[PDB]
Amino acid sequence: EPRSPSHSM
Amino acid sequence: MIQRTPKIQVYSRHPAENGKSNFLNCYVSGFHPSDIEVDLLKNGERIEKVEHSDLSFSKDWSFYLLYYTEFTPTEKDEYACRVNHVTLSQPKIVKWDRDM
Amino acid sequence: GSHSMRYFYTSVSRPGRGEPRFISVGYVDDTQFVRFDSDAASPREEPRAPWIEQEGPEYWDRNTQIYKAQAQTDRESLRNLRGYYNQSEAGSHTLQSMYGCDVGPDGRLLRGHDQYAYDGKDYIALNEDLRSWTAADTAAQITQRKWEAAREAEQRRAYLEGECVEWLRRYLENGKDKLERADPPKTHVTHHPISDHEATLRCWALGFYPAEITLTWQRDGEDQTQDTELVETRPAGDRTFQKWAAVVVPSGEEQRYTCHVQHEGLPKPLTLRWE
């Protein structure tokens, strides 16, 4: 399963 | 900006047998950026309803795609893959050879 | 056996034509098992291998929401990176993401990966310690300080040591023989006269999994490295791979040449001949 998104670059 | 020229291979899924159902493949790899036009041709004419794999890439970040269509090879019918990419000054046409 | 899981994201900006296109694919070893495409009519995670189809609706729902959120995050990242590099707001740019885990036969984590490229250049990568970053340049150092302050490495490490390892183990249990048992190549040699004096011997390996293979031509059991045409390993389209190796030989000397095939699926290395 994919990683939950966190911060933008 | 990074621009990498596509590698192209045209080939069948199974060893070609005239009159026997097969898949015609055009594998484009090693390219950047991902914007690319790939047509399969039968006797110089664009084949409709050609499908492709989901955009993926190698550990060097270069993209690869498989374009394919179901086909029945014959003695006389000529198949090719035509690729357009920002790195190519003209379209690259690779003919299908059943021995490669 | 030893195994890997990887997710590959591609975001491509198209200023003036709406929000960037986001595509994700997931792999176990050399097998693609999921996709998502932000430009699909109703974007959702879709199965691409039979053994993932048994995951319930909560799996597909959760993953779909994650990709939709990541597409918006990548859109923000593309806007930030063209700012960092003082690039035109008119141009198309590419953000690629590649992450996942390598496990051994016992299922324990050997190595975690979480890294990024901008316009095909390495940008930032999580180090093997899963605790620190390598930044390619002063733009990537802006990202690094933002991610250090936000404790991003801890979020990535928790995933790579936890869900990545645990879900890969689950896929290997559900994929059984398709993922654990290598499929050996179907092999044959073909002969193509060039002239009365030269001919091509071509050694074929078809329908093998995984993609790793070695094909070598030998003359009297000595490798013919400098004289062999070797094509890159290519997908058959049915989840298996193809490769061939060719050598040009003097007509009537074919019997001196053997093709050697090494693949994980073979009980032992094959020696083939024109026959």
Helix content of chain C: 10-25%
The oligomeric state of the chains shown is heterotrimer
The end-to-end span of chain C amounts to 35 Å
CATH class of the largest domain in chain C: Alpha Beta
- Characterize the main sheet of chain A: none
Beta-strand percent range of chain C:
35-45%
CATH architecture classification of the largest domain in chain C: 2-Layer Sandwich
Element-by-element helix/strand order of chain C: EEEEHEEEEHHHEEEEEEEEE
Number of strands of chain A: 0
* Helix/strand/pairing category of chain C: alpha+beta
Show the largest interface: B-C, 30 and 32 residues
Share of residues in helices of chain A = under 10%
CATH fold name of the largest domain in chain C: Murine Class I Major Histocompatibility Complex, H2-DB, Chain A, domain 1
Q: In words, what does this structure look like?
A:
The complex is a heterotrimer of chains A (9), B (100) and C (275). Chain A is mostly loops and 9 residues long. Chain A has no helix or strand. Chain B is an all-beta fold and 100 residues long. Chain B has one domain. Chain B contains no helices and nine strands. In chain B, the strands form two sheets. In chain B, strands 1, 2, 5, 6 and 7 form a five-stranded antiparallel β-sheet that branches. In chain B, strand 6 (56-57) and strand 7 (63-71) form a beta hairpin. Chain B is elongated. In chain C, helix 3 (152-161) packs parallel to helix 4. Chain A binds chain C through residues 1-9, and chain C through 7, 24, 26, 59, 62-63, 66-67, 69-70, 73, 76-77, 80-81, 95, 99, 116, 123-124, 143, 146-147, 150, 152, 155-156, 159, 163-164, 167. It is classed as immune system. The entry lists the keywords HLA, HLA-B*07:02, HLA-B7, immune system, neoantigen. The assembly is trimeric.
